[PDB]
Amino acid sequence: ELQEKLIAVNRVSKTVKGGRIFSFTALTVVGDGNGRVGFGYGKAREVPAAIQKAMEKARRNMINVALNNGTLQHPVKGVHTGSRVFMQPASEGTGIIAGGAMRAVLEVAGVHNVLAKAYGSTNPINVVRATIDGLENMNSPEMVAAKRGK
Amino acid sequence: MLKAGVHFGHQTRYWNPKMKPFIFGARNKVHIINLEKTVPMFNEALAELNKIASRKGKILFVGTKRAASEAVKDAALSCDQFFVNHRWLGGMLTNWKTVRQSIKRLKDLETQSQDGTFDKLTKKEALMRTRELEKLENSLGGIKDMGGLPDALFVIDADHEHIAIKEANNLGIPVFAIVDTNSDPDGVDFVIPGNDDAIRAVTLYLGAVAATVREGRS
Amino acid sequence: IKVRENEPFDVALRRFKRSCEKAGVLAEVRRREFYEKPTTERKRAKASAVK
RNA sequence: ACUAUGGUUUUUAUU
RNA sequence: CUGCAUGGCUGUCGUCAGCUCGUGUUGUGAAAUGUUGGGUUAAGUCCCGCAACGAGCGCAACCCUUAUCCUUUGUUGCCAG
RNA sequence: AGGCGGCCCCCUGGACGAAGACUGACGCUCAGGUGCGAAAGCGUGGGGAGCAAACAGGAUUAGAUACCCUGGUAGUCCACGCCGUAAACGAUGUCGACUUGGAGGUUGUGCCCUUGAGGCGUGGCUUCCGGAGCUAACGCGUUAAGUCGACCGCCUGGGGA
């Protein structure tokens, strides 16, 4: 059930001998709509080929989580450099909310409502990979029974 | 008496305090290893390696120094195993899909040097072929037939071949190693007390598990 | 023991090996810890002879 | 050894 | 009229040995590593060593031109008994 | 902190540790308050060898107001005083506490089956690498830029200031 999302795509400029050269770069995520997402970055000549190089990175590793009520099992924190992400679980099917640099990473994994926020610097690659670090921060079940609840 | 012929002991500032479960006490201020549980601990790990051999799983040996290379390069020719001869190429297993280009070239030079025309011009056609062969065998001369990743890795020089663990433990592969009183095990899964000095007992030990891999009927 | 001659003297005797600028005082100071850390590769002493 | 000086502006991003 | 609408055509270093990809690694990334470092060479040609391994374009060779000998070709050219 | 060296004597500040002794939270920080210059300068009075701003003489040169070079005042020195100056920049305010290794030196303090021409614990100082973690990055790295309490100042474009 493979699904892909483009988050951002732009051109870049670079210095060479006595001048400059232009190229394309993309930021993407890929997931299964039910438990996993992977993140990709990529640069190339021609824009579709840059996007495709990012999709191949998003397939190089995926993070697999146990989503609960189409939302988070518990609150989570994710960090990459200056970009800090925090997420509170959402109630009543509503609460979405959050910009594409958080939302796109979760709408590809099967999340329907989530109260995500980003803090610090807003480079979207760092925010997306901090959202992925927050998905490495979530735990699985509802099995260990060590707390009364809830 | 395991020979283990370095066991005496020596050097009070040699051991690692992490090694206590492998230690047999102290003797003349030197902490000494237990050499009477070596085979009991090896047999306990043999059961886990033998689960791989009984399925003909791809097993990789390290024999990367010349006096140990001569105890695997043709001594194991009936065991259908794979080995590292010298180089690790900085990423031989984390980039195997690219190393494949020079495996194909190594086989292209084997098929050229086994061709009937290889007797013609023993310098003017042979030299440029045998030169690249002497390079590629030092890299890949024991792994040419492996066709993919290891199921387990076995090493007898993990005191210096740290790249073996850096590749294996990045790929999730269990490592089988020997340990000495100064060892620092973290990325290795199966450890047996002995010595990593000399060649005889470490190559005879490698040859004793080569039989475990041959009992997998290949 | 480079010069050591007193009283009569002839020719140059200014250009010598060992002590003053390399082997093993002065010069090479940008190498810093190379004067201590390499131990038995660069330092013979150890006691029992000439401290 | 001595041997100074040169205005402002003036390029590449495709659907 | 328009080399500040555009093609087609065009200087020169120098015929210098360098320009540029895929995968891995490394970095927050542009990128870097690679191709750098040691020698040999006309040469990124080879050798040494190797967190890089390989590759396209250039280098080489091809083509082309000159000496020696054999074989081949001879009029309106050549000549030893 | 700035700094402080030369040789001898008298006087004299502060640091650091082990087993015990003593008060019994007596402690920590601190607006204001009271204190402290490497230099240059000024102020009252001396002193002038060495060196030298300024200025002269001669060169080099387009010119040379610089270097070279013949001189030379102030200043440097001293009994001192005033100021609070700076890259006062080893950019780390002051206190408290937890954590990972190594190579090396010193100073206490306690040990050693000391066949050592010495060795090992454990405090203080302390150089340089190095693991976690923090920072954009350098790197910091148990003497932290990690972690986290107490107190007092400072920050929120540059030109203009």
XYZ file of C-alpha atoms (C1' of nucleotides) in Angstrom:
676
model
C 0.000 0.000 0.000
C 2.864 2.329 -0.803
C 2.238 6.123 -0.684
C 4.627 9.037 -1.203
C 4.518 12.753 -0.233
C 6.523 15.659 -1.521
C 6.938 18.260 1.256
C 9.249 20.746 -0.476
C 11.182 21.194 -3.773
C 13.464 24.050 -4.808
C 16.489 25.015 -6.941
C 19.998 25.527 -5.630
C 22.916 27.673 -6.700
C 26.622 26.764 -6.455
C 29.942 28.437 -7.216
C 32.246 26.970 -9.930
C 35.210 28.395 -11.929
C 34.308 32.095 -12.626
C 30.535 31.538 -12.347
C 27.608 29.528 -11.011
C 25.622 26.376 -11.736
C 21.987 25.506 -10.969
C 20.488 22.184 -9.789
C 17.280 20.867 -8.082
C 16.662 19.506 -4.513
C 13.685 17.823 -2.818
C 12.319 16.825 0.655
C 10.027 13.784 0.755
C 8.413 11.109 2.942
C 7.163 7.623 2.076
C 4.854 5.371 4.143
C 2.256 2.624 4.283
C -0.799 4.552 5.683
C -0.962 2.152 8.749
C 2.249 2.074 10.817
C 5.445 3.313 9.052
C 7.161 6.290 7.455
C 10.629 6.984 6.041
C 12.295 10.324 5.293
C 14.343 11.390 2.222
C 16.437 14.253 0.918
C 17.981 14.376 -2.623
C 19.702 16.622 -5.214
C 19.860 16.148 -9.044
C 19.773 17.627 -12.556
C 16.114 17.747 -13.590
C 13.392 18.195 -10.919
C 11.599 14.796 -11.174
C 14.976 13.025 -10.871
C 15.791 15.037 -7.720
C 12.420 14.096 -6.205
C 13.029 10.430 -7.163
C 16.450 10.430 -5.448
C 14.677 11.635 -2.264
C 12.004 8.936 -2.539
C 14.814 6.308 -2.760
C 16.245 7.720 0.510
C 12.807 7.521 2.121
C 12.832 3.765 1.203
C 16.323 3.217 2.654
C 14.883 3.097 6.215
C 11.373 3.425 7.752
C 10.188 3.790 11.405
C 7.328 1.504 12.408
C 4.918 2.597 15.268
C 1.739 1.322 16.939
C -0.788 4.173 16.213
C -3.762 4.333 18.629
C -7.175 5.851 17.711
C -5.464 7.282 14.544
C -3.341 9.321 16.965
C -0.436 8.958 19.420
C -0.110 6.229 22.126
C 1.384 8.863 24.453
C 3.039 12.329 24.176
C 6.452 12.365 22.393
C 9.505 14.536 21.856
C 11.847 14.629 18.814
C 15.041 16.599 18.284
C 17.497 17.364 15.473
C 20.053 20.101 16.026
C 18.061 23.385 16.622
C 14.705 21.944 15.598
C 12.634 20.589 18.520
C 9.293 18.902 17.974
C 6.637 17.976 20.574
C 3.369 16.173 20.077
C 0.318 15.784 22.325
C -2.281 13.112 21.474
C -5.586 14.431 20.050
C -9.187 13.746 21.189
C -12.626 13.612 19.645
C -11.264 12.904 16.066
C -10.310 16.597 15.690
C -7.118 18.539 16.209
C -5.119 18.937 12.952
C -3.524 21.620 13.296
C 0.239 21.484 12.642
C 2.012 22.591 9.401
C 3.142 20.272 6.529
C 6.674 19.819 7.953
C 5.005 17.784 10.784
C 1.630 16.871 9.303
C 2.920 15.351 6.004
C 5.141 12.866 7.975
C 2.061 11.601 9.842
C -0.687 11.767 7.163
C 1.513 9.239 5.179
C 1.702 6.834 8.215
C -2.076 6.722 8.926
C -2.378 9.537 11.548
C -5.709 11.428 11.430
C -5.436 13.936 14.335
C -2.374 15.133 16.262
C -1.358 18.241 18.205
C 2.184 18.647 16.916
C 4.334 21.752 17.409
C 7.784 22.772 16.286
C 10.167 24.971 18.233
C 13.473 26.678 17.547
C 14.707 26.933 13.922
C 12.254 26.143 11.132
C 14.409 24.517 8.420
C 11.843 21.995 7.198
C 14.378 19.128 6.660
C 15.392 19.422 10.322
C 11.713 19.669 11.415
C 10.768 16.618 9.312
C 13.705 14.518 10.606
C 12.916 15.705 14.187
C 9.344 14.524 13.641
C 11.006 11.182 12.643
C 13.091 11.357 15.861
C 9.729 11.791 17.684
C 8.499 8.663 15.902
C 11.594 6.826 17.188
C 10.403 8.279 20.572
C 7.020 6.555 20.570
C 6.616 3.156 22.277
C 4.438 0.124 21.545
C 1.338 -0.965 23.552
C -0.694 -1.347 26.003
C 0.918 -4.703 27.049
C 3.352 -4.347 29.994
C 0.539 -3.513 32.528
C 2.944 -1.852 34.957
C 0.627 1.212 35.583
C -2.987 1.269 36.763
C -3.597 3.560 33.735
C -5.455 5.936 32.948
C 47.832 -25.962 29.343
C 45.555 -24.719 26.516
C 48.812 -23.263 25.025
C 47.803 -20.313 25.516
C 51.578 -20.423 25.927
C 51.639 -16.722 26.958
C 49.664 -17.516 30.180
C 52.082 -16.943 33.048
C 51.135 -14.019 33.726
C 52.641 -10.588 33.104
C 51.735 -6.847 33.092
C 49.695 -5.569 36.130
C 48.295 -2.654 33.950
C 47.134 -4.822 31.043
C 43.687 -6.143 32.025
C 40.297 -4.415 31.706
C 38.101 -4.337 34.932
C 35.124 -5.140 32.671
C 36.529 -8.734 32.208
C 35.768 -9.994 35.847
C 33.361 -12.818 34.797
C 36.263 -14.314 32.678
C 38.882 -13.879 35.424
C 40.291 -16.761 37.573
C 41.732 -14.399 40.212
C 44.960 -12.533 40.549
C 48.505 -13.962 40.622
C 51.502 -11.792 41.427
C 49.268 -8.624 41.009
C 48.263 -9.752 37.469
C 44.656 -10.639 36.822
C 44.487 -13.998 34.969
C 41.916 -15.584 32.683
C 39.956 -18.797 33.197
C 41.321 -21.487 30.769
C 39.343 -24.408 32.297
C 35.904 -23.111 31.129
C 37.110 -22.342 27.511
C 35.585 -25.481 25.995
C 32.395 -25.408 28.190
C 31.803 -21.793 26.965
C 32.700 -22.746 23.337
C 30.290 -25.684 23.394
C 27.528 -23.342 24.750
C 28.163 -21.059 21.686
C 28.704 -24.023 19.275
C 25.019 -24.846 19.636
C 24.161 -21.309 18.264
C 26.676 -21.452 15.356
C 25.689 -25.032 14.526
C 22.074 -23.747 14.061
C 23.511 -21.693 11.113
C 25.676 -24.535 9.703
C 22.763 -27.022 9.766
C 20.954 -24.566 7.347
C 24.093 -23.855 5.246
C 23.911 -20.166 6.272
C 26.671 -17.931 4.912
C 29.507 -17.811 7.466
C 32.382 -15.352 7.236
C 35.788 -16.033 8.857
C 38.485 -13.487 9.549
C 42.092 -14.570 8.880
C 43.495 -11.218 7.824
C 47.125 -11.726 8.901
C 49.350 -13.947 6.651
C 50.140 -16.727 9.216
C 46.399 -17.147 9.864
C 45.407 -16.666 6.158
C 47.370 -19.913 5.477
C 45.026 -21.664 7.988
C 41.818 -20.751 6.081
C 42.648 -19.982 2.361
C 42.994 -23.684 1.426
C 42.710 -25.603 4.777
C 38.922 -24.926 4.706
C 38.446 -25.885 0.988
C 36.039 -28.726 2.021
C 33.914 -26.559 4.467
C 32.195 -24.123 1.963
C 32.897 -21.010 4.033
C 34.002 -17.462 3.148
C 36.943 -15.452 4.422
C 38.591 -12.052 4.686
C 42.198 -12.219 3.410
C 43.508 -8.775 4.337
C 41.401 -5.685 3.391
C 37.991 -4.495 4.601
C 37.797 -1.684 1.931
C 36.428 0.741 4.642
C 32.903 -0.556 3.954
C 33.102 -3.966 2.160
C 29.747 -5.099 3.662
C 27.916 -1.704 3.985
C 28.614 -1.141 0.202
C 28.678 -4.791 -1.091
C 26.417 -3.800 -4.062
C 29.296 -1.666 -5.382
C 32.111 -4.114 -4.360
C 30.285 -6.496 -6.701
C 31.834 -4.580 -9.690
C 35.323 -5.785 -8.672
C 34.057 -9.276 -7.765
C 32.837 -9.505 -11.399
C 36.275 -8.290 -12.548
C 38.026 -10.844 -10.241
C 36.013 -13.613 -11.894
C 36.746 -12.030 -15.334
C 40.472 -12.387 -14.519
C 40.033 -15.958 -13.191
C 38.297 -16.933 -16.460
C 41.108 -15.222 -18.449
C 43.959 -16.901 -16.457
C 42.347 -20.347 -16.681
C 41.824 -19.959 -20.498
C 44.093 -22.108 -22.794
C 45.435 -18.887 -24.437
C 47.026 -17.779 -21.103
C 50.296 -19.669 -21.987
C 50.767 -17.277 -24.994
C 52.938 -14.282 -24.228
C 53.845 -14.965 -20.499
C 54.734 -11.254 -20.219
C 53.137 -9.371 -23.174
C 49.598 -10.732 -22.506
C 49.910 -12.238 -18.957
C 51.458 -9.484 -16.818
C 48.651 -6.861 -17.081
C 46.159 -9.613 -16.174
C 48.090 -11.113 -13.203
C 48.851 -7.650 -11.745
C 45.189 -6.759 -11.150
C 44.595 -10.338 -9.931
C 47.242 -9.963 -7.200
C 45.335 -6.796 -6.037
C 41.834 -8.183 -6.160
C 42.761 -11.456 -4.327
C 44.192 -9.428 -1.420
C 40.761 -7.737 -1.108
C 38.257 -10.345 -2.236
C 40.255 -13.667 -2.722
C 38.145 -15.513 -0.027
C 34.721 -13.753 -0.456
C 34.365 -13.978 -4.320
C 31.798 -16.778 -4.028
C 29.725 -15.350 -1.073
C 27.107 -13.569 -3.296
C 25.675 -11.472 -0.353
C 25.833 -10.713 3.403
C 27.020 -12.973 6.309
C 24.698 -14.720 8.745
C 27.479 -14.675 11.369
C 31.066 -13.496 11.614
C 33.956 -15.377 13.339
C 37.122 -13.543 14.343
C 40.423 -14.332 16.152
C 41.956 -10.835 15.936
C 39.148 -8.559 17.321
C 41.805 -6.729 19.321
C 42.769 -4.927 16.021
C 40.243 -5.859 13.316
C 37.675 -3.434 14.933
C 36.304 -2.663 11.404
C 34.885 -6.217 11.444
C 32.597 -5.198 14.361
C 31.924 -1.702 12.869
C 30.541 -3.397 9.728
C 28.899 -6.454 11.343
C 27.177 -4.554 14.213
C 25.922 -1.841 11.752
C 24.264 -4.563 9.673
C 22.915 -6.435 12.808
C 25.247 -9.487 12.342
C 26.306 -11.487 15.492
C 30.067 -11.693 16.012
C 31.918 -14.674 17.585
C 35.244 -13.728 19.120
C 37.998 -14.809 21.539
C 38.761 -12.655 24.599
C 41.819 -11.876 26.643
C 42.162 -10.133 30.081
C 42.433 -6.701 28.311
C 39.415 -7.130 25.995
C 36.464 -4.661 25.859
C 33.421 -6.471 24.473
C 30.312 -4.491 23.389
C 29.479 -5.079 19.671
C 30.388 -8.846 19.897
C 27.793 -11.425 20.941
C 29.716 -14.675 21.663
C 32.899 -14.549 23.685
C 35.197 -17.357 24.911
C 38.234 -16.889 27.195
C 41.720 -17.710 25.886
C 44.582 -15.865 24.236
C 44.855 -13.918 20.916
C 48.651 -14.266 20.812
C 50.696 -16.681 18.640
C 49.114 -18.528 15.691
C 48.943 -22.283 16.507
C 46.124 -22.521 19.093
C 44.020 -19.722 17.446
C 44.282 -21.379 13.965
C 43.721 -24.853 15.473
C 40.645 -23.341 17.253
C 39.484 -21.790 13.918
C 40.078 -25.255 12.343
C 37.976 -26.874 15.142
C 34.920 -24.682 14.274
C 35.681 -25.151 10.533
C 34.715 -28.779 11.252
C 31.399 -27.550 12.838
C 30.758 -25.687 9.528
C 31.774 -28.803 7.472
C 29.299 -30.945 9.466
C 26.641 -28.747 7.756
C 27.323 -31.136 4.762
C 29.092 -28.656 2.461
C 81.053 17.036 24.039
C 81.069 18.960 20.647
C 83.826 21.513 20.995
C 85.715 20.263 24.178
C 89.159 21.489 22.909
C 90.812 24.248 24.855
C 93.951 26.194 24.089
C 95.217 25.428 20.439
C 92.577 25.191 17.676
C 92.294 24.987 13.817
C 89.511 24.836 11.162
C 85.760 25.240 11.657
C 84.224 22.656 14.085
C 80.813 24.476 14.420
C 78.525 22.044 12.611
C 77.641 18.969 14.730
C 74.913 16.392 15.343
C 72.815 15.841 18.541
C 71.788 18.356 21.249
C 70.794 21.997 20.423
C 68.053 22.055 17.753
C 66.729 18.495 17.281
C 67.887 15.224 18.992
C 66.511 16.216 21.543
C 66.127 19.889 22.671
C 64.914 23.014 20.741
C 63.192 23.125 17.321
C 60.219 20.982 16.248
C 58.081 22.673 19.037
C 54.962 22.747 16.824
C 54.893 18.922 17.300
C 54.392 19.522 21.106
C 53.023 16.261 22.626
C 55.365 14.310 20.223
C 57.955 15.124 22.918
C 56.105 12.918 25.512
C 53.313 10.668 24.243
C 55.250 8.390 21.709
C 57.228 6.939 24.710
C 59.500 3.963 23.628
C 59.467 5.068 19.911
C 61.108 8.448 20.699
C 62.289 8.082 24.379
C 64.941 5.455 25.359
C 65.056 6.425 29.059
C 63.942 4.598 31.480
C 66.387 4.467 34.374
C 69.343 2.035 35.144
C 71.602 4.050 32.758
C 72.230 7.838 32.489
C 68.792 8.510 34.106
C 67.480 48.301 -3.971
C 63.063 50.102 -6.609
C 58.678 49.935 -9.695
C 52.627 54.242 -8.798
C 47.739 53.847 -10.698
C 42.745 51.397 -13.194
C 35.203 55.428 -11.647
C 29.676 53.598 -11.650
C 26.902 49.894 -14.181
C 27.482 45.250 -17.249
C 25.611 36.608 -16.679
C 23.161 31.259 -16.975
C 17.443 28.818 -12.860
C 14.000 26.163 -19.202
C 7.823 22.758 -18.199
C 20.638 49.699 -38.431
C 20.546 45.749 -34.862
C 27.098 40.816 -32.238
C 23.119 43.477 -25.530
C 17.031 40.351 -30.833
C 19.666 34.715 -32.728
C 22.027 30.797 -35.191
C 26.388 29.479 -38.045
C 31.201 30.302 -37.863
C 35.714 32.190 -34.425
C 40.603 33.664 -29.991
C 44.174 30.999 -26.588
C 46.793 28.329 -22.257
C 48.652 23.327 -24.543
C 48.355 19.849 -27.033
C 48.733 21.133 -20.326
C 46.678 16.184 -17.322
C 42.915 17.474 -16.041
C 37.031 17.755 -16.166
C 32.955 14.841 -14.608
C 29.239 10.400 -12.678
C 26.909 5.997 -9.541
C 27.164 3.604 -4.660
C 29.061 3.764 0.226
C 30.950 6.893 4.015
C 31.456 11.694 6.290
C 28.383 16.856 7.363
C 23.213 20.499 9.800
C 23.630 20.913 4.651
C 26.316 23.407 -0.278
C 29.439 19.547 -0.387
C 33.829 16.665 0.619
C 36.116 11.647 0.190
C 36.986 9.606 -4.549
C 40.696 12.352 -8.523
C 44.339 14.077 -2.638
C 49.358 11.907 -0.221
C 54.419 8.971 -1.703
C 57.481 7.661 -6.437
C 57.904 6.565 -11.893
C 56.161 8.935 -16.631
C 55.232 12.619 -21.979
C 50.638 11.210 -18.979
C 44.696 10.799 -13.346
C 50.595 6.278 -17.502
C 51.953 2.894 -14.066
C 54.076 1.560 -9.278
C 53.338 2.401 -3.466
C 49.473 2.826 0.084
C 44.493 2.853 0.743
C 37.393 5.106 3.286
C 36.803 4.390 -0.995
C 35.604 1.079 -5.508
C 34.632 1.553 -10.358
C 33.458 4.715 -14.757
C 32.750 8.504 -19.143
C 35.617 12.642 -21.754
C 40.907 13.732 -22.444
C 46.114 10.711 -22.249
C 47.862 5.970 -24.932
C 46.815 3.320 -29.413
C 44.188 3.788 -33.946
C 45.218 6.822 -38.360
C 49.774 8.591 -40.437
C 55.104 9.010 -41.955
C 60.518 7.752 -42.444
C 65.069 4.466 -42.528
C 66.659 -1.512 -43.425
C 65.577 -6.244 -45.964
C 62.253 -9.607 -48.611
C 58.110 -10.057 -51.704
C 54.967 -7.508 -55.388
C 54.394 -3.588 -59.871
C 57.114 -1.747 -64.862
C 55.940 2.380 -70.384
C 56.310 7.319 -73.732
C 60.830 4.915 -67.332
C 65.191 1.668 -66.216
C 70.099 -1.637 -67.738
C 74.630 -6.372 -65.688
C 77.093 -10.280 -68.940
C 43.523 40.330 37.780
C 47.536 43.446 36.272
C 51.380 40.601 37.154
C 55.977 39.019 39.810
C 62.495 36.707 38.336
C 68.156 38.484 39.501
C 72.597 37.027 45.110
C 71.827 37.372 50.998
C 69.195 38.345 55.539
C 64.825 39.784 58.698
C 59.692 40.250 58.665
C 55.303 38.426 56.173
C 50.259 37.126 53.109
C 47.563 33.176 50.846
C 47.105 27.489 49.402
C 46.843 21.866 50.595
C 46.043 16.851 53.182
C 45.040 12.410 57.049
C 43.266 10.527 61.788
C 41.150 12.890 65.688
C 39.533 17.390 68.513
C 35.778 22.130 69.078
C 31.311 25.434 68.188
C 26.738 23.245 66.659
C 23.992 25.845 60.261
C 28.030 29.858 63.165
C 27.269 29.146 56.071
C 26.568 31.045 50.273
C 25.966 35.246 47.331
C 25.528 40.367 47.554
C 22.535 46.743 45.290
C 25.458 50.287 47.522
C 30.136 50.146 50.587
C 35.915 49.266 51.218
C 40.019 47.715 48.535
C 44.138 46.524 43.787
C 47.587 48.805 37.144
C 50.857 45.984 32.504
C 51.761 50.784 29.976
C 51.356 55.723 28.386
C 50.112 60.588 30.922
C 49.751 64.221 34.486
C 51.315 66.320 39.733
C 55.306 67.723 43.882
C 60.598 66.966 43.811
C 64.999 64.390 41.770
C 67.871 62.033 38.028
C 69.927 61.419 32.620
C 74.418 56.098 31.252
C 71.120 53.003 27.809
C 67.162 53.972 24.316
C 64.136 57.616 22.057
C 59.050 60.059 20.273
C 59.256 65.548 18.605
C 63.035 68.378 15.780
C 67.787 68.790 12.949
C 71.770 66.588 9.474
C 72.476 63.003 5.233
C 70.618 59.489 2.046
C 67.268 56.307 -0.819
C 62.850 58.255 -3.935
C 58.217 61.129 -8.011
C 58.152 62.844 -2.938
C 60.083 59.535 1.701
C 56.631 63.196 6.214
C 59.125 55.560 6.779
C 63.251 51.852 6.790
C 68.936 53.106 6.777
C 72.267 56.622 9.650
C 74.983 60.897 12.846
C 72.515 63.482 17.039
C 68.474 64.388 20.783
C 64.093 66.485 24.417
C 59.997 64.436 26.980
C 59.475 59.605 29.049
C 61.649 55.197 30.999
C 64.500 55.050 36.797
C 63.293 56.989 41.999
C 60.479 59.352 47.034
C 56.147 58.969 45.625
C 50.925 60.909 44.493
C 46.440 60.851 41.093
C 43.737 57.944 37.483
C 41.331 53.444 37.433
C 43.433 52.591 31.415
C 43.995 47.906 27.509
C 43.668 42.442 23.033
C 42.873 44.053 31.786
C 41.793 38.471 25.537
C 44.084 31.903 28.218
C 36.941 35.907 25.815
C 35.347 30.868 31.126
C 30.815 36.158 37.238
C 30.576 33.657 42.598
C 28.811 29.004 45.214
C 26.774 23.655 44.970
C 26.642 18.592 42.721
C 26.577 13.913 39.284
C 29.485 11.510 35.321
C 34.124 8.198 31.156
C 38.929 6.616 29.357
C 44.341 7.527 28.423
C 49.436 9.669 28.056
C 52.395 12.978 31.617
C 54.300 16.072 35.692
C 54.019 18.032 40.683
C 52.406 18.329 45.976
C 50.072 16.359 50.367
C 48.476 11.989 52.714
C 48.280 6.603 53.563
C 49.956 1.984 52.226
C 53.431 -2.076 49.801
C 54.780 -10.522 50.673
C 58.697 -3.120 47.828
C 64.112 -8.797 45.267
C 62.073 -2.147 41.405
C 67.886 0.612 39.059
C 60.944 1.558 43.011
C 55.549 0.327 43.012
C 50.232 1.472 44.358
C 46.005 3.813 46.700
C 43.545 8.700 47.674
C 43.011 14.356 48.089
C 44.886 19.509 45.816
C 47.180 21.637 41.506
C 47.543 20.422 36.133
C 49.117 19.807 30.255
C 47.240 17.484 26.044
C 44.047 13.802 23.385
C 39.462 11.379 23.750
C 33.541 8.798 24.805
C 28.325 10.788 26.048
C 25.674 15.144 25.609
C 25.147 20.664 24.004
C 26.007 24.381 20.092
C 24.876 26.713 13.296
C 30.134 25.607 13.613
C 34.816 25.597 16.087
C 34.706 22.603 19.636
C 33.472 22.145 25.424
C 34.767 17.399 27.184
C 34.777 15.486 35.047
C 39.507 21.902 36.096
C 32.714 21.160 30.636
C 29.998 25.026 26.394
C 26.993 17.888 29.346
C 23.469 17.965 33.949
C 21.082 21.172 37.602
C 19.814 24.294 42.512
C 21.217 29.679 45.180
C 22.733 35.100 44.426
C 24.217 39.694 41.605
C 24.967 42.273 36.829
C 24.485 42.287 31.113
C 21.760 41.334 25.879
C 17.358 42.396 21.847
C 20.606 45.546 13.942
C 24.352 48.492 11.842
C 25.549 54.160 10.054
C 24.794 58.128 13.736
C 26.973 56.776 19.670
